[PDB]
Structure 1
Amino acid sequence: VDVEDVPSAEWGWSHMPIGVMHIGGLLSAAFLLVMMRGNHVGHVEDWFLIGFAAVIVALVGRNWWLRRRGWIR
């Protein structure tokens, strides 16, 4: 990062690599999906896990595509 994005860039840690957040997002959705393997008999919670995992995957994919096409940096 530079000054215009983070004004206090030289005053401390202000940059986090995008790969960590993208991989962490995929692992976040993977952890949501694997939790369907449990002793619960109901499926209402299973659909909530699927929806959140899909939302996280969509956000990660949207950010990766925008970063690849150069729309955002």
Structure 2
Amino acid sequence: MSSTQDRSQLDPEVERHTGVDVEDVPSAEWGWSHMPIGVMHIGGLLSAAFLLVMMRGNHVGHVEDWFLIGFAAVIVALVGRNWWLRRRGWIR
């Protein structure tokens, strides 16, 4: 009871009509809420590529290369799953 409701008029300025919606991100209008999926897909692919490329180096070790392979493989698998699901409309 000892609390007063808040009235806020923040200055707005993309108009959010495209991208994310309040049902998905409740505070979409209040700040940057949408990162294009292409950005994250390409970022994951480049992270996997960097992990694979680190195999080429001055290390006589081999478990290091195998760890890089595994992490790059799971990253690529996640990116591929996301891309495939969004291509099919989030199915399976």
TM bin, normalised by shorter chain, reads over 0.9
Alignment-derived partner of residue 88 in structure 2: 69
Deviating above 2 A after TM superposition, structure 1's stretches of 4 or more consecutive aligned residues are none
Residue segments in structure 1 that go unaligned for 5+ positions in a row: none
Q: CA deviation at 1:71?
A: 1.5
Give percent identity, aligned residues only.
100
Greater Rg over alpha carbons, structure: 2
The CA RMSD over aligned residues, in Å, is 1.7
Compute the displacement of 1:16 (Å). Answer: 0.4
The two structures have a TM-score, normalised by structure 2, of 0.76
**2:9 aligned partner:** none
Query: Secondary structure of 1:16's partner?
Result: coil
Separation in 2 of the partners of 1:18 and 1:72?
17
- For structure 2, the 5+ residue unaligned runs are 1-19
Report 1 or 2 for greater relative contact order, CA contacts < 8 Å, sequence distance ≥ 6. 1
Structure 1 residue 72 displacement after superposition: 6.5
Q: TM-score, normalised by structure 1?
A: 0.96
Higher helix share: 1
